Design a protein around this ligand. Structure first.
Ligand code: P5S
Lengths: 1084, 330
């Protein structure tokens, strides 16, 4: 509240003094969001600088930029034409087209978002208006089942009192209808089309605090301007029902109503393995710096001793030797650049981009009915799926499925049973016992118990008649016979099931217009009147009512609970215990229950208490607390009738999914804004918790932790936790001469909180705010730093579906909010069991194995130059052909890496699901870490030692028998190039463990192609019109002829390739891995 | 959206094959290798020790050396002579050829000092080479056609050998001077500039190399071996790979039927000393020996193969016993 003058009526009128955003450029725009919804990432004209700025956080890309700016210099270059451009451009361009294609959808999505076609008074009258027209502070005429433009007040409507309905299941998940009131004074003044057009009294209110609970401020209209609230204010996504048309003023509008100001703030998401890649690139960078420095020192000393001391090595410069040393210290930085190659950051892209398609081509993930694809969204985080620790879920919709389906109750204590539970209809199968006498049968439910249809249609006892009459009249639905049938304009989606069951169980319910109700006794019309409407109370958990028969009979009905009616009930019930003993049967299953009764008062106390009660009915404030006492005065001697049980169909396979994911040592927490009873019901209905679970609600945990401040609970595990948003906040405690100890006061209570929470095996949080959800997410993400996946249902959770390390959105339903803000998506819940067991660990092992071999195959390729430096006088002369040094990690050894990345699978997926104990390695990092990397390094370096020092010792003695193709330079390279190309391919052959025809095809193609081009490089048939690049013609076509050039390649291969076989076999036998244990006796 | 297509590839059920890698499979490879290296190793080591080799160290760096007298004879081409002796005569054909040491023929600033196009016989690169032979591209604005440090410094020395008779008659040895090259290089690698057989007027302006005391076209009267085809010229072109190396210099031919190619006794090596290595320890020498139907003299391969085979065999049994100990035990 800072004198906004929001101006809820006029169009622009721009009364705004010097208070707009005072920046330094004319791009200044309104303080009040008019209609703009700019949820883009950037603009399409100055995309480049922002994209590239956030692109060069890849240290490897900094490195490659340095290589280009370093190599093209016409001083020391030592390499061929600057042709790193071809792979350099790919890594920075294809990712760009990737996020262009994954971001451009926002344009169209918001365009269709910002068009609604409502009626709004932009001039004189309301007019057709797309959503992007309605400015800040206007007047909207909404229609039946509309789609709320802005969060506005309401001035009039169609209903009496201009009351309205909003289905608040958009900022939350439960779908009970919430009604609202309009402005009290103007309930009679304008209420119409025209006179509002002339209006004044423009109001201001408070800038949002994302609280949804205060809404202060007062009117600016005349006649003793009065305060502002939330009961006359509307929200964004609320859908409309039974409220044909309305009228109000717009206070908050644009893309900053409340939710755009509590939900959002995307971030660039990077997987865990990426951080390790960056660290290790830093380490290899510094290592090659030291190598180049030491070698340049060597070169300078050798030149001083021998450089000017020769004559055949005459240069055109008298540059001092130390200048040569400096001038060669930048000559190895370019022949040792194959450390940290460019090939890594291209092949990574193919790996990830391929694996995504495997995510979203899975038939077993393809839903049947809805025809939904289960498609990925990001196509870059595909390996995080193997390192999860905590899953955060929203009960609304995700676990349940918005269906109630009344199950059964008892009569005089006898249960209804399941399949037959009667004499007749017993030798047939379990098939339905036909309901046919019901004129409006249309049963969306099918029962199999039959004594409950024979006693109905026959009439053996009016106890059931009492039950069903109560189940009908004690409703709150707006029954109305509009179109042939009788319409049930529902209010609370709880009684609906029983009401419809009674409706099609003969007892069709009829009109209840004002005070008089009507109902069909087996179709026969009857009429009553309500003696007193006695509503529900949250504490009371009951709603009573009384009807009078036309001839002068009245009843009572409770519609209550057990621990609320088993105290005030009749004292002369023997059947109370049979009903109770059925009820406590109902506890070993997982559906909620209510208790139903009546009291026999006709006239002796009806009027006597009635006069006092009606006198107390009118009240300034004693209508809910003192009127309650006289209200509850007659609430004794409840002569009981029976009970009722309501189920809640939720999903499929969910208990099995929860079991499996518990096996894999994952912690699963449920966060939602729904109330406590539903939370407790789901606690058992999904088997997160059973007997032997000391729940110890928020009060208890607060008290005990305050006392204790092992893991600070009575040891024994299995302590599920139930928490209110208020009590969550209370325990978190966040509602000149600077000391600021509050954070010191906090930030341990948080640590103790999270430790308690982990030491409880489950956590349920009811009545929580969308801000609170992501808040606890990144709380627990800070302490005990882990990996988090958030699976969502709707719009309230979009704040936390975008904070965790991974976000998954359920699709195929109404879902369109998460499905655009997700990172993965699919159309069930049990499908999760395959995402993290078949795809997660497969992806993790594929990527780790690839990334671990891809450094060995480069180290064991580049260190040969370093070892050779000693015998060319530190001169930066390569040890390879130059039509080979460039094609090595392009064409020779590139395919098998990719095929093993994109095809290899540890064990068959089916038994992988059958054994969810394999997953743990991903969490514990038993495949990649800061140690296995150095092992790859130390295994490549030894291979270089061998590769160089075998042909060396071969070439210090004669090799030429009769053709005289002895040692020279152009042979000391071929006889080592061949050894290098053979060793690495044999190694990848050893690592892979899922052979296919295409794998072996690729490997043997690699070897065969290298030798084929070894020959065909030595034919001038292609050296024509190419006369200055294929120098190494006729070198190996001679060299390979003799035997001594062989019988050393085999020696090197053997000596460097057996010890890895020895280590593999040894460590396999002595310390088998889980996959080994499964695989050996895998038929068993 | 519609259902995904069906493909065993897309569903990852393609036919496969798992690793039958077992304690039973592993060991036979170790042991079959352990007995496949020793036979070849000894079979080649015997031949290695069955070759007779002799160096001479033509350099003679000490003052007592018989050739020190021509260390700095900057007056005339020293026609020096040394005596030596061999103990047992040879058979077959023999090769005689020189060798250097501490001569970094693989240096970077040096291996990149050739001009392949002009060597090939190109008309153009002839009258205008490529700017890479930096000190000497236009000494006085003329082509230097065999241009480059590699070609500049082809070492100049003439050797001859005699066998002394019973009346102090050192008769000459009939040594051949052809075929000692790659058959490829004398055919395609680089040829003379085209035209008729003169080699004189087709080298206009192509001045001699600075350190070449004489221009190429009188290198050898033989029509083939003059120009860019003088086979020794090529042999020096093919750069070696280390600071120590032998280049083929001349061959011999096995005499008619059976008698010693070179019966034992004293021999006289008379050589013109013309080349300055005495500054970088370049102890230049010549050697000479035979070649069998198996190979040269290379003990290192024999010893390496023997050691590797024995070690592989040795480790195999340890693997056997350890897997025996740890099978179905703990
Ligand atoms: C039965 C069904 C099976 C179906 C399977 C189908 C799978 C086939 C996919 C084939 C994709 C092939 C793409 C390229 C192949 C690999 C590329 C590659 O490996 O480049 C690696 C090399 C990197 O060399 P370096 O040593 O690090 O560089 C050192 C030095 N500085 C230098 O200058 O060297 O890079 C280079 O040295 C130069 C690059 C050479 C060529 C690279 C081209 C990359 C372009 C890829 C774009 C295509 C992607 C399009 C996807 C669709 C987009 C809509």
């Amino acid at each position: 509240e800072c004198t906004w003058q929001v101006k809820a009526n006029d169009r622009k009128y721009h009364e705004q003094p010097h208070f707009m955003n005072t920046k330094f450029l004319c791009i200044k725009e309104s303080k009040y969001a008019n209609n703009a919804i700019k949820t883009y990432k950037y603009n399409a004209f100055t995309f480049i600088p922002m994209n590239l700025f956030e692109q060069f956080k890849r240290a490897a890309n900094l490195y490659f930029l340095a290589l280009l700016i370093l190599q093209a210099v016409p001083q020391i270059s030592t390499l061929a034409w600057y042709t790193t451009l071809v792979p350099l451009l790919v890594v920075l361009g294809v990712t760009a087209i990737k996020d262009l294609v994954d971001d451009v959808a926002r344009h169209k999505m918001d365009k269709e978002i910002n068009n609604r076609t409502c009626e709004v008074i932009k001039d004189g009258r309301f007019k057709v208006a797309k959503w992007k027209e309605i400015q800040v502070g206007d007047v909207i005429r909404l229609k039946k089942n509309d789609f709320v433009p802005a969060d506005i007040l309401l001035l009039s409507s169609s209903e009496p009192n201009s009351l309205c309905y909003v289905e608040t299941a958009e900022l939350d998940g439960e779908t009970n209808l919430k009604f609202k009131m309009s402005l009290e004074i103007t309930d009679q003044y304008l209420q119409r089309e025209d006179t509002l057009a002339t209006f004044d009294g423009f109001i201001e209110c408070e800038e949002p605090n994302n609280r949804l609970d205060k809404f202060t401020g007062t009117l600016f209209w005349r006649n003793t301007s009065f305060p502002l609230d939330a009961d006359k204010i509307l929200l964004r996504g609320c859908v409309i029902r039974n409220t044909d048309f309305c009228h109000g003023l717009v206070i908050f509008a644009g893309a900053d109503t409340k939710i755009m100001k509590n939900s959002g703030k995307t971030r660039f998401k990077r997987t865990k393995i990426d951080y390790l890649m960056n660290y290790m690139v830093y380490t290899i960078f510094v290592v090659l710096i030291l190598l180049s420095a030491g070698l340049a020192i060597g070169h300078a000393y050798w030149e001083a001793q021998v450089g000017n001391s020769s004559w055949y090595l005459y240069d055109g410069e008298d540059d001092t030797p130390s200048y040569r040393g400096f001038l060669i210290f930048w000559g190895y930085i370019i022949v040792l650049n194959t450390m940290v190659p460019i090939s890594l950051y291209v092949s990574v892209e193919v790996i990830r981009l391929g694996q995504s398609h495997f995510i979203n081509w899975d038939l077993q993930m393809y839903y049947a009915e809805k025809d939904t694809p289960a498609k990925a969204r990001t196509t870059t985080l595909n390996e995080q799926l193997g390192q999860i620790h905590y899953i955060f879920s929203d009960k609304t919709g995700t676990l349940t499925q918005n269906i109630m389906t009344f199950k059964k109750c008892c009569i005089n204590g006898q249960i209804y049973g399941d399949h037959r539970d009667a004499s007749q209809h017993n030798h047939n199968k379990i098939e339905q016992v036909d309901f046919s006498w019901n004129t409006y049968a249309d049963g969306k439910l099918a029962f199999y118990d039959h004594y409950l249809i024979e006693q109905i249609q026959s009439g053996k006892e009016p106890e059931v008649r009492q039950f069903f009459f109560l189940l009908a009249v004690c409703h709150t639905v707006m029954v109305d016979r509009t179109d042939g049938q009788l319409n049930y304009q529902a209010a609370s989606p709880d009684e609906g099931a029983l009401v419809n069951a009674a409706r099609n169980f003969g007892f069709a319910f009829l009109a209840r217009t004002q005070n008089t109700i009507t109902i069909s006794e087996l179709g026969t019309e009857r009429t009553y009147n309500v003696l007193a409407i006695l509503d529900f109370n949250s504490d009371r958990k009951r709603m009573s009512i009384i009807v009078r028969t036309p001839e002068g009979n009245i009843k009572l009905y409770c519609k209550g609970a057990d621990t609320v009616i088993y105290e005030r009930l009749h004292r002369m019930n023997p059947t109370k215990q049979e009903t109770q003993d059925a009820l406590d049967i109902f506890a070993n299953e997982t559906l909620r229950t209510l208790c139903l009764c009546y009291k026999e008062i006709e006239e002796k106390e009806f009027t006597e208490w009635n006069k006092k009660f009606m006198a107390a009915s009118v009240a300034s404030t004693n209508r809910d607390e003192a009127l309650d006492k006289v209200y509850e005065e007659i609430e004794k001697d409840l002569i009981l009738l029976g009970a009722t049980a309501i189920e809640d169909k939720l999903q499929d396979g969910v208990p099995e999914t929860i079991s499996k994911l518990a096996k894999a040592d994952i912690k699963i927490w449920v966060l939602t804004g729904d109330k406590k009873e539903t939370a407790e019901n789901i606690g058992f209905a999904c088997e997160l918790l059973t007997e032997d679970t000391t729940i110890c609600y928020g009060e208890d945990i607060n008290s005990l932790l305050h006392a204790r401040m092992e893991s600070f609970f009575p040891p024994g595990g299995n302590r599920a936790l139930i928490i209110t948003g208020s009590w969550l906040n209370e325990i978190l405690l966040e509602k000149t001469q600077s000391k600021r100890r509050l954070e010191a006061k906090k930030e341990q209570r948080q640590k103790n909180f999270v430790d308690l929470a982990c030491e409880c095996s489950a956590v349920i949080c009811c009545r929580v705010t969308p801000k609170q959800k992501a808040m606890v997410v990144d709380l627990v993400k800070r302490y005990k730093k882990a990996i988090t996946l958030a699976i969502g249902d709707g719009a309230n959770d979009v704040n936390m579906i975008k904070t965790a390390h991974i976000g998954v959105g359920i699709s195929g339903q109404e879902g369109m909010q998460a499905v655009m803000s997700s990172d993965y998506s699919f159309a069930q819940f049990r499908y999760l069991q395959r995402l993290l067991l078949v795809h997660g660990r497969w992806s993790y092992i594929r990527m780790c194995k690839f990334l671990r071999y891809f450094f060995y195959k480069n180290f064991a390729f580049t260190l040969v130059h370093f070892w050779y430096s000693f015998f060319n006088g530190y001169s930066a002369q390569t040890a390879y052909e130059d039509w080979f040094i460039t094609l090595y990690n392009v064409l020779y050894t590139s395919l098998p890496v990719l095929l093993m990345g994109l095809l290899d699978q540890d064990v068959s997926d089916k038994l992988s699901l059958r054994f969810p104990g394999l997953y743990i390695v991903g969490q514990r990092d038993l495949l990649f870490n800061y140690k296995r990397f150095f092992v790859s390094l130390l295994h490549g370096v030894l291979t270089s030692m061998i590769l160089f020092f075998i042909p060396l010792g071969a070439y210090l003695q004669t090799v030429g028998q009769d053709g005289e193709a002895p040692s020279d330079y152009q042979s000391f390279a071929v006889t080592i190039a061949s050894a290098l190309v053979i060793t690495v391919n044999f190694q990848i052959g050893l690592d892979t463990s899922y052979w296919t025809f295409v794998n072996a095809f690729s490997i043997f193609g690699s070897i065969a192609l290298y030798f084929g081009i070894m020959f065909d490089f030595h034919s001038a048939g292609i050296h024509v019109l190419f006369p200055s690049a294929f120098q190494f013609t006729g070198t190996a076509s001679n060299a390979l002829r003799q035997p001594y050039i062989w019988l050393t390649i085999i020696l090197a291969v053997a000596v460097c390739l057996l010890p890895v076989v020895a280590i593999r076999f040894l460590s396999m036998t002595i310390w088998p891995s889980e996959s080994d244990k499964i695989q050996k006796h895998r038929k068993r | 959206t519609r259902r995904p297509d069906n493909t065993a590839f897309k569903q990852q059920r393609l036919p496969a094959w798992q690793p039958i890698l077992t304690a039973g499979t592993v060991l036979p490879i170790f042991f079959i290798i352990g007995l496949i290296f020793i036979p070849i190793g000894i079979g080649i080591f015997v031949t290695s020790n069955n070759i007779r080799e002799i160096e001479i160290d033509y350099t003679g760096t000490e003052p007592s050396s018989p050739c020190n007298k021509c260390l700095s004879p900057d007056v005339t081409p020293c026609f020096c002579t040394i005596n030596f002796t061999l103990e047992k005569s040879f058979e077959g054909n023999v090769f005689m050829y020189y060798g250097l040491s501490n001569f970094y023929q693989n240096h970077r600033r040096y291996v990149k000092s050739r001009d392949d196009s002009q060597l090939n016989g190109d008309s153009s690169a002839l009258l205008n080479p490529s700017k890479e032979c930096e000190p000497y591209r236009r000494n006085e604005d003329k082509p230097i056609a065999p241009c480059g440090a590699i070609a500049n410094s082809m070492f100049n020395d003439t050797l001859e050998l005699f066998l002394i008779g019973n009346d102090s008659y050192p008769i000459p040895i009939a040594l051949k001077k052809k075929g000692i090259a790659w058959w490829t290089d004398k055919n395609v690698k680089f040829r003379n500039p085209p035209g008729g057989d003169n080699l004189e007027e087709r080298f206009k302006g192509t001045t001699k190399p600075v350190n070449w005391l004489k221009p190429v076209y009188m290198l050898d009267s033989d029509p083939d071996n003059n120009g860019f085809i003088n086979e020794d010229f090529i042999v020096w072109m093919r750069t070696a790979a280390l600071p120590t190396f032998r280049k083929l210099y001349r061959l011999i031919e096995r005499k008619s039927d059976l008698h010693p190619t070179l019966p034992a006794g004293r021999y006289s090596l008379n050589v013109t000393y013309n080349y300055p290595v005495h500054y970088f320890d370049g102890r230049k020498r010549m050697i000479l020996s035979t070649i069998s139907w198996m190979g040269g003299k290379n003990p290192f391969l024999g010893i390496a193969y023997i050691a590797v085979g024995s070690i592989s065999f040795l480790l195999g049994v340890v693997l056997l016993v350890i897997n025996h100990k740890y099978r179905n035990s703990s």
